[model samples]
Target: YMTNGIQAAVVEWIRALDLEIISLLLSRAWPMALLATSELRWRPTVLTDTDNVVRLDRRQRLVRWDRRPPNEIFLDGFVPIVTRENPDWEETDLYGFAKNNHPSIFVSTTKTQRNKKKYVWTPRNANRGIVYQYEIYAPGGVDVNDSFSDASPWPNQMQVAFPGGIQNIYIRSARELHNGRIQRIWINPNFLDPGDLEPIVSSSRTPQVIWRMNHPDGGHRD
Candidate 1:
């Protein structure tokens, strides 16, 4: 964060590529979303927010995420949340924001600075951002692997989303993974441990659209 943002044996950094999503939807090809359930399908994989922070990785998927430092802002989505504090206007804050939305879970993604060029963190820590189970088309599936090296069943999916269901989101950026290259990686703590896991007041669940950050009084809709 290992070549790794987001690759783990469990979550395995399953993402939907914007270009692919658009192409398939335009063609009315729903099966494409079903095929995109594996690590192979998550192009430029990683979990980030509206501001565009390069968090997590797409290759060498890890079973357990390393810990992060406290200094790191722990971004999720910049808008509808904490963008005012981020200099680049990228709200890369995840630590406390997840907790604020979901009280039952502990997203313990702590931070630690080992040296000048490295910042190690544990992504699996309970405090890390634990979004609800991802969404997918009906009659989908998920592949569970025993090792971090590979995720069997390749691409799998969940049938549906929760509450309002899948909609638009300010996703994170990712490194390109050539087709058939098997984008498997991990987020090494040494690569990005800022300092400590700071708290975030807002995240994806709190607001509607990120564009509404301009509303000083905090309106209900985006």
Candidate 2:
């Protein structure tokens, strides 16, 4: 009875804040795992047809859409790791080279239902998946931006299988740059597991172990 009363008091306090205030608070203080559940609306532009090119627009200081010839087909919404040759000049200018080229984490992915041709047939075999980008600061002096120069066979093995060391890196802080539309498919049919359905029925139910831990005699008193 006291637990219910405590929960009610907590709810009442939370109810005082409007959604905007709550959202701002959550954005700042919520755990990363909890923050990840927020809806992702960003979609990357996909150039399936042989008409457009992906080149840096010097005037806008942004990659712009242009026609094909010397221009290559660009699938937008993917950020390559900034390297010495192709450093993010803009970000480097703003946040220095060291801070600009930190390692990125994949946040989420969306499948485009509108594009029946999801796998665009090309010489390079272009297959597209929309992904959200997030990054964490490296411990120290680890330049993820540097090209892999180790003689180890593992790096080569990975490079052969995956052309880029990692792909589709995005910064969550730059959410304003994201734009696209797609259907959000929470489960992959190929990787289906029964545990995926557990969240639906598990709400508001505390596990038995939690209760046992709180008991004075290691739950033997019960």
Candidate 3:
């Protein structure tokens, strides 16, 4: 739509490999038990690769590349900070320490892909029904209260009111603090080459219009 100076003027980000991703199921979105980084990495980022996706989560914040090699098993900056004794809803020790030194660690997550298969709506079909037949279901199994699900048949199709669903994925740390500041983590699936990004059929709607970026064939660029 507006490609001229869009990329630079608006925002820019490094590839997932170039930076770290954070996961905070500690305070709010806290998921109990062992978690998976690879799955979460594909969550979302502040600056989405595109737009028109479904957003179910509350926080999808991201920062910059800080080398907190706390544990290889962890995703971006999630592991080291996951402690039962978190003083404040801060990133785990590894994340906090590393981020303190390397500061680009504060952007929000953007749900770039949800029911992506449904958001296939193009400008040509804008008037017909800018609908995404895919679905973006929220996770409820991860909580103590167990109150989840962005919505049943949640976001498979919604009019493209915003250029992109940038706000949805802006991750907030599940970890909370007395001060009320959440340890934010950003999810960026853009790293997933358009090909590898999976397409989930909507329990909400079918025949989605989800748009695809990067690897048209399917999969991450890596």
Candidate 4:
């Protein structure tokens, strides 16, 4: 059946072309591999053809174009300084300073005074002592913590709080320091387009939320 043979060949050729088209579209639309620490020399620039797309210039420092709207363009490859430090404890002791006065003098002067129990110091819990810190150098003066804060012009320092902990956070790049401290870099989610993450899923049947498990073969327990 020559007709059947020709039909099969044509169908296979069409499928190959469809795969090529899909891959090309995926490459262009999806997020690209993050630039290395050394490669991040210049600021990000918006593409001339698209308002939402941004390109990194690796030659010099950051450059801002006045023609573009404020906070509208998405810049890729900016890193922040992240640290974990101990919480700030209260300076005052549990008891008042009056207790520090000469106990003998107070006892001798006032017959109404009663003998007090000895005080001992207790250590705080280890888990509650640590905190995650983020120091971001935002040129736009944009407050990353405040959702209501308007985007300002170039050059502003921002502080972010991590009350809920930094679990499942997406980091663009990171490096270990000489002191065994980790320095992590991440692009602000506010600057990114929501649509850029659409291609992360293979199909509609896949679950929107995926949990990270320690097992080698996904989540199956051996």
Whose lDDT is greatest here? 3
Prediction RMSDs, each to the true structure: 19.9, 22.9, 18.9, 29.1
* Superposed model 1: Cα runs more than 4 Å off: 1-7, 10-48, 57-196, 200-222
TM-score of each: 0.16, 0.15, 0.18, 0.16
Give me the displacement of residue 53 in model 4, in angstroms: 9.5
| lDDT of each residue in 1-222, candidate 1, tens digit only | 112212211111122223333223212322344335422222223433113444332211111121221112112211122112111211121211221323211121212222322233322333433211111111111112211113232212110111111111211111111221212121212232222323222334333222222333222111
Error of 2 at 114 (Å): 4.0
- Quote the lDDT for 48 in model 1: 33
| lDDT per residue (tens digit) for residues 143-212 in model 4 | 1212112321111211221111121122111111112222222133433231333122123442332222
- Candidate 3 minimal-lDDT segment of 10 residues: 1-10
Q: Which residue window of length 10 is worst by lDDT in model 4?
A: 105-114
Q: What are the lDDT scores of the predictions, listed in order?
A: 0.21, 0.20, 0.22, 0.19
* Candidate 4 lDDT for residue 54: 37
lDDT of 3 by residue, 159-203 (tens): 111111122222111211112222222223423221223433223
**Candidate 1 weakest lDDT stretch, 10 residues:** 158-167
Q: lDDT by residue for model 2 over 53-142, one digit each (tens)?
A: 331111001111111111011112223233233323242221121122233211111111113432211212112323211111100111
- Model 3 bad stretches (over 4 Å): 1-50, 55-71, 74-77, 80-222
Better of 3 and 4 by TM-score: 3
Selected candidate, larger TM-score, 1 vs 3: 3
